[PDB]
């Protein structure tokens, strides 16, 4: 319409508005953006890597003042659609992420209420890093965190905060190798620094148990119960050897594969 | 009134003439001294067959540029800026020792810039550069891999570097659980190169790290020893048996497997032997 | 008098006040009608270790724009322009489950401008997308997998998806030698 | 060179050249592209995945009548080297790709003659599918 | 410094200097380029792949005769330092190359002296086709 096209023109006039320039008003004060993860998708679990990939959509929430307007001057509009890379936006990024990709991955519209309020759901893939515990493989429990920051402001300039104490699993598919058990989401201060922090999202998820069960574990066992089978075999059959090296030799293999599959840390067996 | 406006105002101001390619210096026999610092994020691979160092790192700059000063009395009491790092002068600080990866930092995160003309800039940064690797004892191996960081096409009279802190920052380290880093120290060089006639001077960290043991350990150590311990059976088994070959045979080529392993994890360089590669060796010679 | 100077002159007027940011319509209450279709140029991949697809498609979509609109008459009988995509709005349609790739389109072709305001818009794309694998019986084994396209920011009461077509188009189908389309049809949700 | 300088202003003046029209006038005629692939290197031919990896250069050449000048005007200048981004080019790009990457990888300089004759070399490194033979 | 800012202006200014053209003063005239080669470190040798990767600094050197400026009238400046991306490069790069990167990785600053002369010096990860005898 001829109403939005002004409107959006008047908005977005580089002349009145510095996308460069936070929205900060009454002073010294701060952005205040409210985060929220949505996982959408749990990709997978890279052990050997020690990688995790999350389809999740970014919900971020803040007001600017300069993106106001008066619902009558425009036809009664009361919200519209601005493209993101044209506007001020709080830069959160995944801080641990692997592979160095920082940012969103689409960068969709931003929705701006009249008074100004800002809603902002970008969709993302992130491969974060975390730490595998290898101990109870493959009845294990993984604990993988995700730390969202901003990588241009500090706490001077604006304050992350979380939207709910969990994260959504409105919209989910469920894995099918490892299933969701705890997703809280935690506001962290640093008591010695206030200039840092960063809203950090744990994911408690669990392996099930059945493939590698039937993979691995029922061969090991068959092979380790003809460990002792060489003590009653009888001398002059001429077959002990090869009986007890073969069972050495699977064992040995066994081990070797399994090294393959768990990641190449040293601080548990 | 508004903190954005006067914002406004202070950027209007700071880049009407302001020349991004020209060194920031009021006069053209001042240097440009940069505190140069490195902070590890985590350590992602010490790939030992490429003898590449794979590291997540803040490189933190800092400098002043003469030009970008105001006075915070006139602008709302703004006494700092995040500005686009792309809209201003830096310094070009490059790996020297880069091998498969980029010579300069490519994210170009906002700057940090004081109305006293102070400049701030910690960008992130993957750097995979080239080391020597000695595997003479691994798995109980220490490693020693360099990174010479220096300015590219400026030397010591035009940029000179200045060590923000000897020590690598490990803050914010990420645990590996694969290597531990004994010492990370930075030292400050300066030498001249055929291809100029001036001084470039730049900082190298070295990176002093420790395997943890454990994993190849139990991998290939153990069961090294275990086939080891067979060499000497077939002397003893009776020639009745018909077995004797077997058992040889074995051996043999376990530890010619084993020896395999071995040569697919270490570099293939020639001027040191690991001692497992020895031992593996001459055993299967005997 | 020639057909450039015409195109020239159609091409100014069109784009003389121009919003791209601006949803197409004259009347706020109007929806946007995207005619949307897929055509697969290939399969390329069936990751079942890694529960990915990755096919080679051509994303088919046609809309009206209110603005792009003229009279032949006055241009010498142009009837249709080929202009580049980034310069005419766009529907944000962006593909859910995506897993490996990109969420919306990024090639980014030309768009064919009619002179009733119809716009249709047929860019490559390159989509990795998640599928749920069943190896019950594999090697005899038939899968399932899905493809989710939506507008991302814009809800059914500016923004509706027709389907162009039931079946997916495989008139220009590269076949693979290992997987057979046994049916492929997409569904309004 | 100055006059070369003059010449490059002279034929891509926005006023007088527009690269999203195409260089059809008197109606809708046909703009004849000529073809040519000259096959750098064959890089690789993947059976498992039946891709194959070439280095070649898609010489193409057309007659833009827009891009004509005098040469006695211009120091008998009768060839000059334009930017392949600021003419209109013929979108020509390999169809049966795999990977997905249609276009060329360089988009060189464009060699544009006093008549109007376009020739251009744009080099490119494709991943195009092929039916692998195994028997 | 105010004059060095000035003195890059002037010489970099789109309305007087088109990166785009050859620095030749007359249309016959050639522009020398001068190659060297430093190895900094030789990476890898790949038999299999048969590819060579190594770590150069290919210094290139020539004259534009637009880049010159008298000292006198810029406080006695001799040389200054330019990006490599805004002025007029020879396009110098590895023909032969195994990985489709032609160009150097940096584009590092480019020195320029008053007279015209260009000194630049950019690093590079090559990486070259060889045949490799494994007899
Ligand atoms: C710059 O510094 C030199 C060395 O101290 C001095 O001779 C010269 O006068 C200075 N220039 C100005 C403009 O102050
Ligand atoms: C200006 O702001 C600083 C904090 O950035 C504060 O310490 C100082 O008191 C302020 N001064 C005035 C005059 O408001
Ligand atoms: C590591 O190497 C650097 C540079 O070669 C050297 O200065 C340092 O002493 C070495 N340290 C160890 C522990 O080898
Ligand atoms: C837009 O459509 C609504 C619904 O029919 C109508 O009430 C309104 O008058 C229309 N606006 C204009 C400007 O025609
Ligand atoms: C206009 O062009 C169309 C084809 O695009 C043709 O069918 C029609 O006859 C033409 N009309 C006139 C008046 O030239
Ligand atoms: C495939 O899945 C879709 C949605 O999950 C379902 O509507 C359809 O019936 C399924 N078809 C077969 C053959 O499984
Ligand atoms: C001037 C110039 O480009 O020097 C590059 C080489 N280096 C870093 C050894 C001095
Ligand atoms: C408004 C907005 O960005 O919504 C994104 C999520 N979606 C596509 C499920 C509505």
């Known amino acids: 319409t001829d109403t939005e096209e002004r409107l959006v023109e008047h908005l977005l006039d580089p002349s009145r508005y510095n996308k460069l320039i936070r929205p900060a008003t009454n002073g010294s004060e701060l952005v205040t953006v409210q985060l929220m993860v949505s996982l959408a998708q749990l990709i997978s679990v890279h052990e050997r890597e020690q990688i995790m990939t999350t389809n999740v959509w970014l919900t971020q929430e803040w007001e600017d003042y300069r993106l106001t307007w008066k619902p009558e001057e425009f036809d009664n509009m009361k919200k519209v659609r601005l493209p993101s890379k044209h506007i001020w936006l709080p830069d959160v990024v995944l801080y641990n992420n692997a592979d160095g990709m920082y940012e969103?991955?689409?960068?969709?519209?931003?929705?701006?209420?009249?008074?100004?309020?800002?809603?902002?759901?970008?969709?993302?893939?992130?491969?974060?890093?975390?730490?595998?515990?290898?101990?109870?493989?493959?009845?294990?429990?993984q604990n993988c965190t995700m730390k969202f920051r901003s990588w241009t402001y500090d706490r001077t300039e604006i304050d992350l905060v979380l939207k709910s104490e969990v994260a959504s699993l409105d919209?989910?598919?469920?894995?099918?190798?490892?299933?969701?058990?705890?997703?809280?989401?935690?506001?962290?201060?640093?008591?010695?620094?206030?200039?840092?922090?960063?809203?950090?999202?744990?994911?408690?998820?669990?392996?099930?148990?059945?493939?590698?069960?039937?993979?691995?574990?029922?061969?090991?066992?068959?092979?380790?119960?003809?460990?002792?089978?060489?003590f009653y075999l009888p001398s002059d059959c001429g077959e002990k050897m090869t009986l007890c090296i073969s069972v050495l030799l699977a064992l040995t293999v066994f081990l070797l594969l399994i090294s393959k599959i768990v990641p190449p840390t040293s601080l548990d067996v | 009134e508004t903190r954005a406006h006067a914002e406004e105002r202070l950027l209007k101001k700071l880049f009407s003439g302001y020349n991004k390619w020209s060194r920031p210096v009021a006069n053209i026999s001042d240097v440009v001294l940069v505190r140069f610092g490195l902070s590890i994020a985590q350590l992602i691979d010490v790939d030992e067959k490429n003898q590449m160092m794979t590291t997540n790192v803040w490189?933190?700059?800092?400098?002043?540029?003469?030009?970008?000063?105001?006075?915070?009395?006139?602008?709302?009491?703004?006494?700092?800026?995040?500005?686009?790092?792309?809209?201003?002068?830096?310094?070009?600080?490059?790996?020297?020792?880069?091998?498969?990866?980029?010579?300069?930092?490519?994210?170009?995160?906002?700057?940090?810039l004081f109305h006293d003309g102070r400049v701030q800039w910690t960008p992130p940064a993957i750097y995979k550069s080239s080391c020597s690797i000695d595997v003479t004892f691994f798995p109980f191996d220490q490693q020693n891999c360099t990174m010479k960081f220096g300015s590219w096409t400026y030397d010591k009279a035009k940029i000179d570097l200045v060590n923000m802190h000897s020590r690598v920052d490990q803050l914010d380290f990420w645990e590996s659980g694969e290597?531990?880093?004994?010492?990370?120290?930075?030292?400050?060089?300066?030498?001249?190169?055929?291809?100029?006639?001036?001084?470039?001077?730049?900082?190298?960290?070295?990176?002093?790290?420790?395997?943890?043991?454990?994993?190849?350990?139990?991998?290939?150590?153990?069961?090294?020893?275990?086939?080891?311990?067979?060499?000497?059976?077939?002397?003893?088994?009776?020639?009745?048996?018909?077995?004797?070959?077997?058992?040889?045979?074995?051996?043999?080529?376990?530890?010619?497997?084993?020896?395999?392993?071995?040569?697919?994890?270490?570099?293939?360089?020639?001027?040191?032997?690991?001692?497992?590669?020895?031992?593996?060796?001459?055993?299967?010679?005997?």
């Open chain 1, 171 to 230: 919209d989910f598919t469920p894995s099918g190798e490892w299933d969701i058990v705890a997703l809280p989401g935690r506001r962290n201060e640093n008591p010695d620094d206030s200039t840092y922090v960063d809203i950090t999202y744990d994911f408690i998820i669990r392996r099930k148990p059945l493939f590698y069960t039937i993979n691995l574990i029922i061969p090991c066992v068959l092979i380790t119960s003809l460990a002792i089978l060489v």
């Open chain 1, 104 to 141: 969103v991955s689409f960068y969709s519209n931003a929705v701006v209420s009249y008074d100004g309020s800002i809603f902002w759901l970008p969709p993302a893939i992130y491969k974060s890093a975390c730490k595998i515990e290898v101990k109870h493989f493959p009845f294990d429990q």
């Open chain 2, 179 to 286: 290597w531990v880093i004994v010492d990370a120290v930075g030292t400050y060089n300066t030498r001249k190169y055929e291809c100029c006639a001036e001084i470039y001077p730049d900082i190298t960290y070295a990176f002093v790290i420790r395997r943890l043991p454990l994993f190849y350990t139990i991998n290939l150590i153990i069961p090294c020893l275990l086939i080891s311990c067979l060499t000497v059976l077939v002397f003893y088994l009776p020639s009745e048996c018909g077995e004797k070959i077997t058992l040889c045979i074995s051996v043999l080529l376990s530890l010619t497997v084993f020896l395999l392993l071995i040569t697919e994890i270490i570099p293939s360089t020639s001027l040191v032997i690991p001692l497992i590669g020895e031992y593996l060796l001459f055993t299967m010679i005997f």
């Open chain 2, 59 to 112: 490189v933190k700059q800092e400098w002043h540029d003469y030009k970008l000063r105001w006075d915070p009395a006139d602008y709302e009491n703004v006494t700092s800026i995040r500005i686009p790092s792309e809209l201003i002068w830096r310094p070009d600080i490059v790996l020297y020792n880069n091998a498969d990866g980029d010579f300069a930092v490519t994210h170009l995160t906002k700057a940090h």
